[PDB]
Amino acid sequence: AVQLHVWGPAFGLPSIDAECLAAIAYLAQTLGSADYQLIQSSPSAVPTQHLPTLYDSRTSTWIGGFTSITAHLHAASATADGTAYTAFLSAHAAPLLALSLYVSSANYGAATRPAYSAVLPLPLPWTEPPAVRAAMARRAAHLGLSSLKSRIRLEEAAREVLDVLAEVDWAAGGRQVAAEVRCLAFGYLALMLLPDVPRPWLREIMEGRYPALCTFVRDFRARVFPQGGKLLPWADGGAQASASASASAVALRFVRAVMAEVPLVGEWWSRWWTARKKREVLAS
Amino acid sequence: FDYFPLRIYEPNELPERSQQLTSGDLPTLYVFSTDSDARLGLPSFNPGCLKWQTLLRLANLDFRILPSTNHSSPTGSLPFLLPPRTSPTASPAPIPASGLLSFARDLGHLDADLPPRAQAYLALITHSLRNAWLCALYLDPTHDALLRRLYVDPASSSRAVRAALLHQLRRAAAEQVATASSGGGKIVSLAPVDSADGIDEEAVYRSARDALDALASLLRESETAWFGTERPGSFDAALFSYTHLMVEYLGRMVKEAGNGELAEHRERMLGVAWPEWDGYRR
Amino acid sequence: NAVVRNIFGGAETLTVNATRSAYNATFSTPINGNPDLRLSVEALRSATQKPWASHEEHLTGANLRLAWLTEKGDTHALAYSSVWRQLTGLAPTASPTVRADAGDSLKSSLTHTFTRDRRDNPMLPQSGYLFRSVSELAGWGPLNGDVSFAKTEVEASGALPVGVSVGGGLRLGVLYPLPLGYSLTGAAQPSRINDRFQLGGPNDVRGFKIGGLGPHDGVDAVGGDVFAAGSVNALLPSPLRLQLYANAGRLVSAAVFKGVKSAVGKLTNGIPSLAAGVGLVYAHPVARFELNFSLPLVLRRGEEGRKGLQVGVGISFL
């Protein structure tokens, strides 16, 4: 009776972020429709504040992150490569993702902002997508590229990642990896391919140069995510009515975020809040 | 115009503090060392600098080492170099961290395009292992004494300033760890999360134990005592930059990675880099 | 700005938020009724930029000051200060003397400012004469910290009419390192770059750049311990009048002693820099604009002297 908290169904992938989509694929391949619940949520609706979060009903513990979630629910060069790529996708690949859909303004404002505003309550989109863009842009450093013949640098910063991810043999070959790192690749290689954006420079690179990835990302979704991934055991209310357990609470989500923005006492108020919230995790 | 300067005399005899430090005869690498072990040339204690110093000592460059303080630098990062001074009032331009191997010159092995596979492991070193060094040094009260003995005491020596520095360090260390998704991608403000509670000392530490298990597994496949090569390259020096500072100062994990691969490898880099030294192992 | 003209007696607070910044939470008060013994308490924080030695400087300290105005025109001001003095701007091509001094310090010190001013117009000398002393004893004995010196500075101008008003001037200074504890013996740490003197530009010795005329390390102007400067005017003629200046200047425990006796011994070996040039003075009630024209004569190699049109304004010229 595990209980995961994920983002919304926005772009045809039952999630809008790589971590939670990866966790959803893992759970859907491993556990079964009668074990989890997928309570769609928001980062300010959980003690961990790191949204892809398992809540184990048996002992009532919050487990943040995808790696830590995989810590539960479970030659050696195989697992060596598994750890290597699982550490190479959380960085040098999340920034390449965040370069689109989170930094490029011509793309952030036509598909991602409606995505967020269509999965939260009414007053929340006024504050949270700003924080999400801020985080994904801060992680989008260490690349030197910004909101931009100034595109050969872009294609090179994309090859420096897709070339490493290319020789994996994600689906069969080269070097079979694992059942928890594969479901992580499809977590990133989906939001880098599938979205319908108005400023595409990530699709054609992979579709035009890397066929081994195009087939996997298309074959994988054809395996566990048929017809948009609604067959997953969502909450009882439905896709949109999933976030029903939390108008009273939504106000508290609003005041907490906006109060952390006053100039001087804001920072200290935030540090008092997350320090109080975290001590609920260890106690759990 | 005209010839107005009627007498031009000799140069003006630079001050005292700029004759003892910057006299110069050898290229002078500026690292995070201490004055007692900066003359003997012992390794630094800041891994982002021990990496470059190890590369240079592998580059067969004979040079000096002088401590510094992270503000005197062409860029933000410290380990720059300053070529020897040619005339007592004029010096060549510094050399930023990136070009230390461009100035050090068969030195092609230390800077090569790594195979597409080992470029994936370098994430373990620079992102998984680097966070365990930040989380365990700065944001652990056990090492409150150690951090104080290295990064602040030789800075200001005035208890109202050491504390102002110490707080600006941990506010910076807790930031660079709270961003890499090993510890936490917690979303809390349109501001970075710089606090020892925006992360978790469990997730960061558990990945580091998994890192040193993957790295130790790569070395057993090499059968040439180094990571798939013949002589120490840019990948051996990057792991030794962390597998040492965590052993000289997490320590039982290195010596227990696999069967002793990372502990033995470190003791075989201090046979190629520091051949006459003794006194490691804490 | 912001003022408060009373709290209890004749007290006052203040705040100025204006180089790149400053925040002076000044809080003045007279003591024992007498309206002269103006005691102050200031807590400033500023990040000023100094381009002649290419870096910044972040003073982030606080100083306590006690002024006093006797009945003969002179004015004593015994001040205690504690600052931070961080140098964090060595981004451009800076010279390896400043790369050895980025660092950080404290500089607990204690000054004393004594200015007997008998000049008629403080902006345009006609018959008066100014004397001014600034004695400073940084961290030593009770004053802790990590800089330990002893700095003094004397300026004694002149003027004489015969309106024509032949002028004059003089400055001096010595920076003496001292040990760190309750003694006159021991280790005397050499001086850093936030304590050495500067001398040049249109305010001090007309005819050189704002920081030149000193020991140079390439393009940056690191200071010097001991120094001296002169001047001679004419001030020939409404406040708008003309000028003929011919300036000058230099800039350079048994160990620390024979070091100073050697420098000031060198201070009289050879012609000084000794610039020259004419100008037009404008005696505004708050300032003195110059708009001059200079031709430097003698130079110590590498000292960057201007060669004309040196417009500059201030209060304390030479």
CA B148 to chain centre: 18
Q: Which of B120, B184, B189 faces A164 most closely, judged by CB atoms?
A: B120
Residue whose C-alpha is closest to residue A62's, from A54, A70, A72 = A54
Residue whose C-alpha is closest to residue B147's, from B129, B162, B159 = B162
With 0-12 / 13-18 / 19 or more C-beta atoms within 10 angstroms meaning exposed / middle / buried, residue C67 is middle
Asked if B207 is an interface residue toward chain A (Cβ–Cβ < 8 A), one would say yes
CA B91 to chain centre: 25
Token duo for residue C27:
């809080």
Any idea how long chain B is? 282
Amino acid at B146: L
Residues of chain B whose beta carbon is less than 8 angstroms from a beta carbon of chain C are 1, 4-18, 20-22, 24, 30, 68-69, 71-74, 82, 85, 89-91, 93-94, 155-158, 161, 165
The alpha carbon of residue C132 is apart from the nearest alpha carbon of chain B, in Å, by 27
CA C174 to chain centre: 12
Phi, psi (deg, nearest 5) at residue C22: -175, 145
**Among positive and negative, which fits the CA dihedral B8, B10, B11, B16?**
negative
Q: Is the CB of B187 less than 8 angstroms away from the CB of A80?
A: no
What is the separation, in whole angstroms, between the first and last Cα of chain A?
A: 17
Q: How far apart are CA C316 and CA C318, in angstroms?
A: 7
User: 10 Å Cβ neighbour count for C125?
Assistant: 25
Question: Which residue do the tokens 């208890």 mark?
Answer: B159
Report the helix count and the strand count for chain A, using DSSP H and E: 12, 3
> Are the C-beta atoms of C137 and C150 separated by less than 8 Å?
yes
Question: Which residue do the tokens 């020939």 mark?
Answer: C236
User: Which chain C residues are Cβ-neighbours of B31 within 8 angstroms?
Assistant: none
Q: Is the CB of C101 less than 8 angstroms away from the CB of B14?
A: no
Q: How far apart are CA B53 and CA A284, in angstroms?
A: 46
DSSP conformational letter for B74: S
Any idea how long chain A is? 284
Q: If residue A53 lies in a helix (H) or strand (E), which one and from where to where?
A: strand A53-56
DSSP conformational letter for B70: S
Q: Count CA atoms closer than 13 A to B131's CA, side-chain side.
A: 31
Question: Strand, coil or helix: what is B259?
Answer: coil
Q: Which of A84, A134, A271 faces B195 most closely, judged by CB atoms?
A: A271
Helices (H), chain B: 17-20, 36-39, 47-58, 100-103, 118-123, 130-137, 144-147, 159-179, 203-219, 236-243, 245-248, 251-254, 261-269
Q: How far apart are CA C109 and CA C80, in angstroms?
A: 6
Q: How far apart are CA A124 and CA A45, in angstroms?
A: 11
Q: Which of residues 7-66 of B touch A (CB under 8 A)?
A: none
Residue whose C-alpha is closest to residue A5's, from A58, A67, A68, A48 = A48
Give me the resolution in angstroms, 1 decimal.
Answer: 3.7
Q: How far apart are CA C291 and CA C312, in angstroms?
A: 6
> Are the C-beta atoms of C143 and C101 separated by less than 8 Å?
no
User: 10 Å Cβ neighbour count for A145?
Assistant: 18
With 0-12 / 13-18 / 19 or more C-beta atoms within 10 angstroms meaning exposed / middle / buried, residue A151 is exposed
What is the DSSP track for chain C?
--EES-SSSS-EEE-EE-----EE--EEEESSS-TT-EEEEE---EEEEETTTTEEEEE--EEEEEEEE-TTS-EEEEEEEE---B-----SS--TTTTTS-S----EEEEEEEEEE--SSTTS-SS--EEEEEEEE-SBTTB-SS--EEEE-EEE---B-----B--EEEEEEEEE--SSSSS-S--PPP-TTTSB---HHHHSTTS-SS-SS-BSSSSB--BS-EEEEE---------EEEEE----EE--HHHHHHHHHHHHHTTSS------EEEEEEE-SS-EE---EE---EEESS-----S----EES---
Q: Cα dist. C1→A97, B78, C15 in Å?
A: 49, 40, 6
Q: How far apart are CA B216 and CA B129, in angstroms?
A: 13
Question: Strand, coil or helix: what is A3?
Answer: strand
Residue whose C-alpha is closest to residue A68's, from B204, C66, C300 = B204
Q: Count CA atoms closer than 13 A to A144's CA, side-chain side.
A: 7
Question: Which residue do the tokens 């694992």 mark?
Answer: A178
Q: How far apart are CA C152 and CA C225, in angstroms?
A: 11
User: Which chain B residues are Cβ-neighbours of A44 within 8 angstroms?
Assistant: 187
With 0-12 / 13-18 / 19 or more C-beta atoms within 10 angstroms meaning exposed / middle / buried, residue B34 is middle
Q: Is the CB of C298 less than 8 angstroms away from the CB of B7?
A: yes
**C174, β-bridge pairs:** C152
> Are the C-beta atoms of C197 and C223 separated by less than 8 Å?
yes
Residues C168, C174, C180, CA angle at the centre, nearest 5°?
Answer: 160
User: 10 Å Cβ neighbour count for B43?
Assistant: 25
Q: Is the CB of B191 less than 8 angstroms away from the CB of A270?
A: yes
Q: Which of A65, A132, A164 faces B119 most closely, judged by CB atoms?
A: A164
The alpha carbon of residue B85 is apart from the nearest alpha carbon of chain C, in Å, by 9
Q: Which of B9, B15, B158 faces C106 most closely, judged by CB atoms?
A: B158
Most B-contacting residue of A53, A69, A90 (CB-CB within 10 A), to test interface: A90
What is the CATH code of the structural domain delimited by B118-269? 1.20.1050
Method of determination? Answer: cryo-EM
DSSP conformational letter for B90: B
CA B243 to chain centre: 12
Chain C residue with Cα closest to B14: C215
Phi, psi (deg, nearest 5) at residue A91: -150, 145
The alpha carbon of residue B197 is apart from the nearest alpha carbon of chain A, in Å, by 6
Question: Strand, coil or helix: what is B257?
Answer: coil
Which residues are within 8 A (CB) of C14 and not within 5 positions of it... i.e. 6 or more apart?
C1, C2, C3, C4, C24, C25, C26, C27, C28
Q: How far apart are CA B189 and CA B231, in angstroms?
A: 47
Q: Is the CB of C190 less than 8 angstroms away from the CB of B93?
A: no
| β-strands C46-50, C55-59 pairing | antiparallel
Q: Is the CB of A90 less than 8 angstroms away from the CB of B180?
A: yes
Residue whose C-alpha is closest to residue C70's, from C8, C140, C134, C117 = C117
Chain B residue with Cα closest to C225: B15
Residue whose C-alpha is closest to residue B15's, from C191, C209, C86 = C191
* DSSP percent split of chain B into helix, strand, coil, nearest 5: 45, 5, 50
Q: How far apart are CA C39 and CA C67, in angstroms?
A: 6
Q: Which of B195, B211, B217 faces A274 most closely, judged by CB atoms?
A: B195
Residues A19, A22, A28, CA angle at the centre, nearest 5°?
Answer: 140
Kindly give the interhelix angle for A211-224 and A182-191, rounded to the nearest 10 degrees. 100
Q: Cα dist. C283→A186, C122, C245, C279 in Å?
A: 78, 9, 16, 13
Q: How far apart are CA C99 and CA A257, in angstroms?
A: 44
Q: Please report, to the nearest 10 degrees, the dihedral formed by the alpha carbons of residues C116, C120, C122, C126 taken in order.
A: -110
Q: Please report, to the nearest 10 degrees, the dihedral formed by the alpha carbons of residues A5, A10, A12, A16 taken in order.
A: -50
Which residues are within 8 A (CB) of B167 and not within 5 positions of it... i.e. 6 or more apart?
none
Question: Strand, coil or helix: what is B9?
Answer: strand
Question: Strand, coil or helix: what is A4?
Answer: strand
> Are the C-beta atoms of C40 and C31 separated by less than 8 Å?
no
User: 10 Å Cβ neighbour count for A152?
Assistant: 8
Residue whose C-alpha is closest to residue A268's, from B140, B195, B187, B179 = B195
Q: Count CA atoms closer than 13 A to A69's CA, side-chain side.
A: 32
Q: Is the CB of B214 less than 8 angstroms away from the CB of A84?
A: yes
Token duo for residue C150:
């002893």
Q: Please report, to the nearest 10 degrees, the dihedral formed by the alpha carbons of residues A42, A46, A47, A49 taken in order.
A: -20
Q: How far apart are CA A129 and CA A127, in angstroms?
A: 6
Asked if B223 is an interface residue toward chain A (Cβ–Cβ < 8 A), one would say no
**Among positive and negative, which fits the CA dihedral B119, B124, B128, B129?**
negative
**Among positive and negative, which fits the CA dihedral B69, B71, B76, B79?**
negative
Q: Cα dist. C279→A225, C125, C157, C232 in Å?
A: 85, 15, 19, 13
> Are the C-beta atoms of B166 and B145 separated by less than 8 Å?
no
Q: How far apart are CA B125 and CA B243, in angstroms?
A: 10
Token duo for residue C291:
């708009």
Token duo for residue B171:
């506010």
Question: Strand, coil or helix: what is A64?
Answer: strand
Residue whose C-alpha is closest to residue A137's, from A110, A99, A106 = A99
**C56, β-bridge pairs:** C49
Q: Which of C99, C224, C299 faces B72 most closely, judged by CB atoms?
A: C99
Token duo for residue C89:
């701007």
> Are the C-beta atoms of A128 and A43 separated by less than 8 Å?
yes
Phi, psi (deg, nearest 5) at residue C62: -155, 140
Question: Which residue do the tokens 């790589």 mark?
Answer: A18
Q: How far apart are CA A162 and CA B10, in angstroms?
A: 61
User: Which chain A residues are Cβ-neighbours of B189 within 8 angstroms?
Assistant: 131, 134, 257, 260-261, 266, 270
> Are the C-beta atoms of C76 and C113 separated by less than 8 Å?
yes
User: 10 Å Cβ neighbour count for C123?
Assistant: 19
Residue whose C-alpha is closest to residue B246's, from B134, B152, B168 = B134
For chain B, domain boundaries: 27-101, 118-269
User: Which chain B residues are Cβ-neighbours of A79 within 8 angstroms?
Assistant: 214, 217
Q: Cα dist. A259→A45, A268, A270, B186 in Å?
A: 16, 11, 8, 18
Q: Please report, to the nearest 10 degrees, the dihedral formed by the alpha carbons of residues A165, A171, A174, A176 taken in order.
A: 100
Q: Secondary structure of B93-126 in the HEC alphabet?
A: CCECHHHHHHHCCCCCCCCCCCCCCHHHHHHHHH
> Are the C-beta atoms of C179 and C190 separated by less than 8 Å?
no
> Are the C-beta atoms of C275 and C305 separated by less than 8 Å?
yes
Q: Which of residues 167-196 of A touch B (CB under 8 A)?
A: 167
Q: Which of A43, A77, A92 faces B123 most closely, judged by CB atoms?
A: A92
Kindly give the interhelix angle for A152-166 and A211-224, rounded to the nearest 10 degrees. 60
Q: Is the CB of C101 less than 8 angstroms away from the CB of B17?
A: yes
> Are the C-beta atoms of B166 and B147 separated by less than 8 Å?
yes
Q: Is the CB of B213 less than 8 angstroms away from the CB of A83?
A: yes
Q: Which domains does chain C show, CATH number per domain?
A: 1-296 (2.40.160.50)
Q: If residue A128 lies in a helix (H) or strand (E), which one and from where to where?
A: helix A128-138
Which residues are within 8 A (CB) of A228 and not within 5 positions of it... i.e. 6 or more apart?
A9, A12, A14
With 0-12 / 13-18 / 19 or more C-beta atoms within 10 angstroms meaning exposed / middle / buried, residue B256 is middle
> Are the C-beta atoms of C217 and C106 separated by less than 8 Å?
no
Amino acid at A127: T
Q: Which of A84, A260, A278 faces B120 most closely, judged by CB atoms?
A: A84
Residue whose C-alpha is closest to residue A64's, from B139, B181, B195, B191 = B181
Which conformational region is residue A207 in: left (phi greater than 0), alpha (psi within -120 to 50 degrees), or beta?
alpha
